Amino acid sequence: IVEGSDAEIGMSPWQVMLFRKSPQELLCGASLISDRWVLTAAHCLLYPPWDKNFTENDLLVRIGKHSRTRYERNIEKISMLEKIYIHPRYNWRENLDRDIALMKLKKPVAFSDYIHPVCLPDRETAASLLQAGYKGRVTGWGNLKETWGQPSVLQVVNLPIVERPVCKDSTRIRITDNMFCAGYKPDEGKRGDACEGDSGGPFVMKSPFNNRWYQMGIVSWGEGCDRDGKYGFYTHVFRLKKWIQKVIDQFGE
Amino acid sequence: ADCGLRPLFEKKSLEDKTERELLESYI
DNA sequence: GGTTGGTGTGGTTGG
Ligand SMILES: *C[C@@](*)(O)[C@H](CCCNC(N)=[NH2+])NC(=O)[C@@H]1CCCN1C(=O)[C@H](N)Cc1ccccc1
Numbered sequence: 425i426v427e428g429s430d431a432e433i434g435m436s437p438w439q440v441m442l443f444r445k446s447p448q449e450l451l452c453g454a455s456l457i458s459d460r461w462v463l464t465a466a467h468c469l470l471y472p473p474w475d476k477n478f479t480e481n482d483l484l485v486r487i488g489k490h491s492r493t494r495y496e497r498n499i500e501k502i503s504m505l506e507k508i509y510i511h512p513r514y515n516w517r518e519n520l521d522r523d524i525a526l527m528k529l530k531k532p533v534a535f536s537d538y539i540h541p542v543c544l545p546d547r548e549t550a551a552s553l554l555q556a557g558y559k560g561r562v563t564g565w566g567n568l569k570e571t572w573g574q575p576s577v578l579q580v581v582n583l584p585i586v587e588r589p590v591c592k593d594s595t596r597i598r599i600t601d602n603m604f605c606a607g608y609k610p611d612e613g614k615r616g617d618a619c620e621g622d623s624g625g626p627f628v629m630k631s632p633f634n635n636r637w638y639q640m641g642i643v644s645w646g647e648g649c650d651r652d653g654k655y656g657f658y659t660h661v662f663r664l665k666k667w668i669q670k671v672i673d674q675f676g677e
Numbered sequence: 678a679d680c681g682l683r684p685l686f687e688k689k690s691l692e693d694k695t696e697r698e699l700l701e702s703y704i
Numbered sequence: 705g706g707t708t709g710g711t712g713t714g715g716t717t718g719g
Binding site for chain 2: 432433434435436437438457535536537538540541542543544553557558559560561580582584628629630632635636637638
């Protein structure tokens with residue numbers, strides 16, 4: 425995360441770090457949406473234009489972290505991917521439409537002080553919350569500056585949902601309905617954004633309905649990190665729930 | 678079931694140093 | 705990894 429802070433312990437029981445076997449490195453963030461299913465961005469697993477094509481085999485899931493670096497000896501928990509499901513219309517070629525992927529863990533994650541799943545958006549909550557100027561919370565072990573350098577800790581940033589249109593005159597990229605942008609405006613005199621490392625990251629909300637937290641976005645792309653005039657593109661988790669709920673409810677946990 | 682309710686935050690009726698930013702958004 | 709304490713939640717500067 426760019427221009428943000430340390431996560432306080434247990435600030436995101438959901439936040440999961442998915443990271444490579446060999447070489448033993450980090451590739452992305454995930455959110456644990458239940459004891460067995462994990463929500464990530466697909467481009468973490470597949471971007472044919474850079475050779476990203478990881479496999480249940482080559483990837484590792486580790487739930488309950490805090491420090492980037494150290495293996496959190498008795499909080500942190502490491503899991504075995506049973507399968508990954510990229511979304512049929514994933515569009516890696518053009519602009520990342522429904523740049524999502526579930527992956528079902530080998531065996532169920534025990535919950536804890538530290539491990540807890542996030543709420544998945546209901547049609548309702550989606551209606552009321554996803555609104556411009558409204559803040560949302562993004563998190564992770566990503567570059568601290570677009571270029572250099574990395575946190576030893578989970579960074580958290582509070583960014584405002586941006587107007588549907590504004591997003592658009594920001595990037596020549598062809599923006600869609602399975603995309604929501606988020607940021608502080610040039611002048612809004614406040615900063616932060618996700619970054620190269622972040623992706624699959626949950627972008628959460630707290631319904632002041634029940635005080636539950638909700639995944640709304642997912643980290644997706646945008647140009648650079650914290651470019652004046654640029655805004656991070658997340659994934660309309662909602663917008664894509666049905667496919668989301670089709671599978672869990674098909675071969676899910 | 679008991680999604681997005683933290684065992685050390687919501688769950689012990691405490692809130693984070695930034696949560697508040699978030700419900701002040703919704704105005 | 706690094707101040708044998710703290711989510712690197714014991715007691716082995718590692719593992
Ligand atoms: C994997 C990631 O975490 C990352 C998210 C970073 C986005 N930056 C900000 N401020 N939100 N995703 C990516 O970097 C994706 C995957 C491949 C390229 N990419 C990008 O966001 C490019 N920077 C832009 C892009 C190129 C082609 C198609 C879509 C987007």
